[PDB]
Every structure is written in C-alpha cells, then in structure tokens.
Amino acid sequence: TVPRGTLRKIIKKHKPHLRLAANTDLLVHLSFLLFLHRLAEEARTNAFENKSKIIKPEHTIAAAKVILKKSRG
Amino acid sequence: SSLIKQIFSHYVKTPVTRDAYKIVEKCSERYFKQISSDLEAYSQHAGRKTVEMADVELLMRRQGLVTDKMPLHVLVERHLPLEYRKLLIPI
C-alpha cells in the first residue's frame, strides 16, 4: 500500500511542470524504497560499529551522506 | 510520515530512536528533491515534459540498482506488491 497522489505531489513540490506518465510513479516509489533499504543497511552497520543496540541519529546521518551520494542520477 | 517509519523499521530490523526516524524523514525529503532534478534533466534532455518508464529505469541504473545481473523487472517482482507488479509487469 502507498499514496500515489502523495508521490505525484512531492515531485510537483520540487518541479511543478514535471509530468509523470501513468505508472512511472510506481518506479519512483520503488527507487525510494530501495533508497530506504540502502539507508537501513548502512545505518545498521554504523550502529553495529558502535556496539549500539539501537539505531541513533548519527548512524542515520553518516549513512544518509553515503547513500545520497550513491543515489545521484 | 508514519509510512516512512514502517518501511525503515521493516528494513533495519532493529530498534530506532525517535530522532533517528526524524532524520530518515529529512533525508527522504532530500532524496526526492535530488531525484526530481535528475528526472527533469532526463525529460528536458529528451526534449519533452513527461517522465517515462525508461527515465526512471535510467535513474535506477545510474544509482547502481539496475545492472546487468539485476534487471529492473527483478527489483519490481522482489519489492512491490502484487497490485503494482500487475500494472508494471502484466506479462
């Protein structure tokens, strides 16, 4: 389950004159899911490196830097 | 939103602080901003105003997600629910 409308709106927020063809919002959503997956693996590795039993802001922030770098088009 | 939490927790498989989640949300906003500019580049470069399937596939190839060993349809089958696979991969 997922808010397709929300996707379309998000993209519009950034580029209001971008048109999404009919099912492309679904591939966009997929790329986002894979983004969060990568983020989760990197963050968990950060946590594990600190022997932190929980995921902390700094794990996710360092991980974000790495993964957004991988997410460039 | 709440959804981003469900997904992130689902993938991370361990407990996550409130602040950590807040970061994930911020970074997600960043993600969409960045890809929005890439998708615009693809469209403008192909002289059109729409995002096509091939554009987002190219995005995901550039991101190292789609590769020769790992074609797009495999990611779709693996990661999206039946109702979406039906639209994306009806054959």
UniProtKB/Swiss-Prot annotation, chain B:
Chain coiled-coil ranges: none
Location in or out of the cell: Nucleus; Chromosome, Centromere; Chromosome, Centromere, Kinetochore
Family the UniProt entry places it in: Belongs to the CENP-T/CNN1 family.
Subunit structure: Component of the CENPA-CAD complex, composed of CENPI, CENPK, CENPL, CENPO, CENPP, CENPQ, CENPR and CENPS. The CENPA-CAD complex is probably recruited on centromeres by the CENPA-NAC complex, at least composed of CENPA, CENPC, CENPH, CENPM, CENPN, CENPT and CENPU. Identified in a centromeric complex containing histones H2A, H2B, H3 and H4, and at least CENPA, CENPB, CENPC, CENPT, CENPN, HJURP, SUPT16H, SSRP1 and RSF1. Interacts (via N-terminus) with the NDC80 complex.
UniProt miscellaneous comment: Association with CENPA-containing complexes may be indirect and due to the proximity of centromeric nucleosomes containing histone H3 with those containing CENPA.
Known role: Component of the CENPA-NAC (nucleosome-associated) complex, a complex that plays a central role in assembly of kinetochore proteins, mitotic progression and chromosome segregation. The CENPA-NAC complex recruits the CENPA-CAD (nucleosome distal) complex and may be involved in incorporation of newly synthesized CENPA into centromeres. Part of a nucleosome-associated complex that binds specifically to histone H3-containing nucleosomes at the centromere, as opposed to nucleosomes containing CENPA.
Domain notes: The largest part of the sequence forms an elongated and flexible stalk structure that is connected to a C-terminal globular domain with a histone-type fold.
Protein name, as recorded: Centromere protein T
Gene name linked to the record: CENPT
Residue window of the full protein shown: 538 to 628 of 639
